[PDB]
Amino acid sequence: MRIYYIGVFRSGGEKALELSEVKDLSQFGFFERSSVGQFMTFFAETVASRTGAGERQSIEEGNYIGHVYARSEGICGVLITDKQYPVRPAYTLLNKILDEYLVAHPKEEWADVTETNDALKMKQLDTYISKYQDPSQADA
């Protein structure tokens, strides 16, 4: 009943160019969190990959959901959370994140970015995914 992964990834070729990767390992132990973390990213990269930009993707898995929100430039962001985390707040979260990606550096500066990763990071997408763990974080 909480968000497990957040991030951003530009739709590349076979997979999504990992823009940024943030995880939430609350229920997963020290050893489990590692395996689940890989599960999160691989799934987050897949969504951005299956998301052909300008569209949204909510991947319903037998454990959690994988919300997705793409921009009209070429680089989209992914938001993977439990089914008990509506798409509306994920919309708000992926709203600040996508707009946040455009701010950290001009829209064209990245323009898909043939080279990105969690290295760049984003206080927004990170602090959001961390606190958003709850039902929605709809300004409460």
Task: Please give the domain boundaries of the chain with CATH numbers for all domains.
Answer: 1-140 (3.30.450.50)
| Backbone angles phi and psi of 130, in degrees to 5 | -70, -50
Query: Measuring CA to CA, how many Å separate 100 from each of 42, 92, 96, 103, 117?
Result: 23, 12, 5, 5, 15
Q: How was it solved?
A: NMR
Strand order in the sheet with 3-11: 16-23, 3-11, 75-81, 65-69, 59-60
* Strand boundaries in the chain, DSSP class E: 3-11, 16-23, 59-60, 65-69, 75-81
Structure tokens that stand for 108 in this block: 């064209």
What is the C-alpha separation between 25 and 99, in angstroms, rounded? 26
Instruction: Write the CB contacts of 50 (distance below 8 Å, at least 6 apart in sequence).
Output: 57, 59, 68
Contacts of 105 (CB under 8 A, 6+ apart): none
Q: Find where tokens 């999504």 sit.
A: 16
Q: Which residue reads 């076979």 in tokens? A: 14
Contact by Cβ (8 Å): 5, 128: no
CB atoms within 10 A of CB 57: 19
Separation of alpha carbons 72 and 128, rounded Å: 22
